Amino acid sequence: SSQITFNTTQQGDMYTIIPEVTLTQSCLCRVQILSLREGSSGQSQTKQEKTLSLPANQPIALTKLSLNISPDDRVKIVVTVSDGQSLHLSQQWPP
């Protein structure tokens, strides 16, 4: 049931997205966070790749993404958790 989810809150057009990994087996895992926002007022992009010790059964919060999302912006947050064996999980926000 190992899964990536997203906790989200908002101040008007100001959104805070905190990705959460919960794994059934602990892991020395490769974690990648991509973000892209684009629209009328320009654009913003992030990428990060990190190896971390994630325990089992315990939701581990990834770094905050703070995005100004206007009407008709195109936005994406993509989180990928892998152990380089048989775990490969990937989820996008919004859902």
The domain made up of 1-95 has a fold known as Immunoglobulin-like (2.60.40)
C-alpha to C-alpha distance for 6 and 80, rounded to whole angstroms: 13
CA nearest neighbour of 18 among 67, 89, 53: 67
Burial of 19 (0-12, 13-18, 19+ CB in 10 A): buried
Q: Does residue 60 contact residue 21 with C-beta atoms inside 8 Å?
A: yes
Method for this entry: X-ray
Rounded to 5 degrees, φ, ψ at 74 are -105, 125
Rounded-to-integer distance, Cα 78 and Cα 31, Å: 11
